[PDB]
Symmetry: D2
Subunit: 123 residues, 4 copies
């Protein structure tokens, strides 16, 4: 797998959150996320998908994953999905944008979703 080895490993973003991921041979992503920010403590299950056969033209590798913010310590009734691309090489990075949706009443639904961007670097 071209990027299997490149994607799999331990990453950290600009907040200092940590993203431990394994890129499967079938395109699957699995691992754990630990947020340095928000209503989060310890590690949360993640799962996702990546393009296991990216273009050979210098293109990044598209990928995405979801965390639901429930674990054995806390439940923030929320989920974040990161959508981005892996860029291999010198400085491998995963450049993402994300959508954090909280469970709300219908009167509060208009304000359910935060949006942001995380840049990940490896170890």
């Amino acid at each position: 797998g071209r990027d299997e080895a490149g994607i799999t490993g331990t990453w950290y973003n600009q907040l200092g959150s940590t993203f431990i991921v394994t890129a499967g041979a079938d395109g699957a992503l699995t691992g754990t996320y630990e947020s340095a920010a928000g209503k989060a403590e310890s590690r949360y299950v993640l799962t996702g998908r990546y393009d296991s056969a990216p273009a050979t033209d210098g293109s990044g590798t598209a990928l995405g994953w979801t965390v639901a913010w429930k674990n054995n310590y806390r439940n923030a009734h929320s989920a974040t999905t990161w959508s981005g691309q892996y860029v291999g090489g010198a400085e491998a990075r995963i450049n993402t944008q994300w959508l954090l949706t909280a469970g709300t009443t219908e009167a509060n639904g208009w304000a359910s979703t935060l949006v942001g961007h995380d840049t990940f670097t490896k170890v």
Copy 2:
């Protein structure tokens, strides 16, 4: 599981795309997506997460999932993540916003990501 039965099943969105999902007992989401739009043909693997213990106060249930747009028929070098909440009842619906990231060169990276909103209804 409160919403296990509610979330699991076959959903269709406003474009007529179909979202077949199984809500796991551990918070996992799995299934297949078939897009009525874009560079997509037939079904694509999805995986995601949902809050398996949502608030009892009339709140929706937060959830998210990823499709990488590679299957046996086509590869669009792209991934969509849907971020939203399930709202049970009369009219069960899953109200989402999504981020579609394509693999790009670094000169084209500024325009890598589309954003939209899909509303799903069951069968």
Copy 3:
């Protein structure tokens, strides 16, 4: 014009007027001949009271292939009654015709400390029509 009034572009008359979204917020806009959008916004939701000044831009010469007309506008949520230290931009398109519509997505950013910066921005979607709830 032939009757003596001024000649309106396309979307000038269509966009200009009073609009309502699914929250029941009120969007009073005047589309300028130069591409300017001006007016007021009254939100039915959130930390908002009375009317807020808005300004924006729209494509005053849109494609003639059936496509909508692109536009956008900003409200900063400060007026003489309230300051929510935040601003919303709507980006969308106008779709003319029988039931005219403005279909938008929006980005609401709040002023924050650097430590709360990751959570500065809300995202959503509003559909506007000229029919009142």
Copy 4:
């Protein structure tokens, strides 16, 4: 003022000037005393040529707790050289100080047919500084 010039608010002087994002696009803005944002935009990327009019709004009385100052602005991508039938809104905050910054997210919506409506909108993030590349 004491020397005879006009008294600038906070962010009035800080925001007003010439800015550059990581693409090397050029953002020339004047922050009005009334909360108005006006100026021009020259994009180094995409279907754009020369300068585009912009308008927006900013919080002219921001919190005094160290938080940034919220703002937003629209460009419709039509000028006398090019029409990309599309409009970008930036939503973000101004962070004053040693290296002042404007940290934004943006929504670029194109006019589309209803069948291409699902793909109307691009999303991204630009950081602006007053230092040129």
